[PDB]
Ligand binder design. Sequence first.
Ligand SMILES: Cc1nnc(-c2ccnc3ccccc23)[nH]1
Ligand SMILES: Cc1nnc(-c2ccnc3ccccc23)[nH]1
Ligand SMILES: [Ca+2]
Ligand SMILES: [Ca+2]
Lengths: 116, 110, 110, 116
Amino acid sequence: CPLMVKVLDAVRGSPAINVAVHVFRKAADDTWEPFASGKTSESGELHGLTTEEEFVEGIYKVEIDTKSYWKALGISPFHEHAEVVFTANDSGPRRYTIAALLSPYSYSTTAVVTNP
Amino acid sequence: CPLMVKVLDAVRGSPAINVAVHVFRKAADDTWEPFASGKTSESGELHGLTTEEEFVEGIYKVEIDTKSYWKALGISPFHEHAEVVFTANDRYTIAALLSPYSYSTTAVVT
Amino acid sequence: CPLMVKVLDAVRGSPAINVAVHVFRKAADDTWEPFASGKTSESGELHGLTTEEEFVEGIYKVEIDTKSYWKALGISPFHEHAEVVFTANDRYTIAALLSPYSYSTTAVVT
Amino acid sequence: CPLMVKVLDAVRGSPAINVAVHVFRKAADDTWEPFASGKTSESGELHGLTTEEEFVEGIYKVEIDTKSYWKALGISPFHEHAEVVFTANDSGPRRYTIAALLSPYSYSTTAVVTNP
Ligand SMILES: Cc1nnc(-c2ccnc3ccccc23)[nH]1
Ligand SMILES: Cc1nnc(-c2ccnc3ccccc23)[nH]1
Ligand SMILES: [Ca+2]
Ligand SMILES: [Ca+2]
């Protein structure tokens, strides 16, 4: 799994479950093209987005649907989403974990990049 | 003063100075219209972006050029930028704390 | 103004108002001597804690009473408090962003 | 494992490896007593601190030695440590993950609490 996403909820102290995640890749023409999508599991983790073959060099955007997450819990959140945009695999293939921690008016994100 | 951006550096323990910030408003065709821009000051703050009459309800995007910031300090960064997207509903401070492989953002709405 | 504390609320998107803050300095016997205290203001800030002559080099602890803060809002919190411990070496802002099960802290030293 | 600690490095985008962690429990007399200690692994994780039998109700303090971590990397950090202090198991046994994200002048911490 060269790309994994993990989401936590800072209000409840829990994994953020059933969070939709959409991944895009910048095309030659500078537009965002769909790349992969999925939803977090009961552990707040999303595996299986992509493969070593499909996850080529490029500029990727990981868009985490924070707004729907909070709205489902009955809460009115501030942000439309949380996005992470980065260049991947420039110096050869790497594994990337994008982690996010969510509150209604705030989020943080970190990347863990490892060399297979 | 309806909209202010404040940027902090978690590596140096300082304001993030001379950070480029561009603000956009979402247009009816779902594209992003330029709205405001500037560079953070010596205090890491960017004031004077808009006025009450100009800042209508809508979806706004604050694009912070974190990559140029880190490169100007000689530090290797992960992100292309940090973009913060929110709805304004009828004073907003967008605050960001930057590290090379992470960022945090909060809204202070008073 | 050598020492300021600023507290923000990530749930409400606001300053964290009326938060109790106690500052201590580490004594030669490794116990903690009271140094300063106060409650954050309407802006989430606590100024006027010390003076330049009083704030000598040493190890300082800033204890923020996050549990009382959350309970006064009717919200169930994880932590007993948030304590931030650092060395002052010859202006410091200790900033904290609070959530019920998490907190973040940074130092702005100028 | 009722108590786990995970540490990440926000500068390098990596697990924070070889971080010392000391856990204390408040005694009857209101002092901190040693409870357990260990160091993070190559994954930035510390397992095996305690057991279901030993991890009784109480007020616990998890002290993460951030200062030594940065100093070993040749960096002068701001904080002496990062601590997390919480009441555990008050409404019955729970599993607790304390996660921390480190930068030289900043840290964040979150708790993930689950019901076995
Ligand atoms: C998953 C996961 N493992 N550690 C974290 C984490 C902890 C503290 N602060 C954060 C801020 C941003 C993203 C993750 C984190 N998340
Ligand atoms: C002052 C001041 N205005 N914003 C912070 C802030 C913003 C985002 N994330 C955080 C994480 C930790 C501490 C402060 C912050 N500090
Ligand atoms: Ca290349
Ligand atoms: Ca009990």
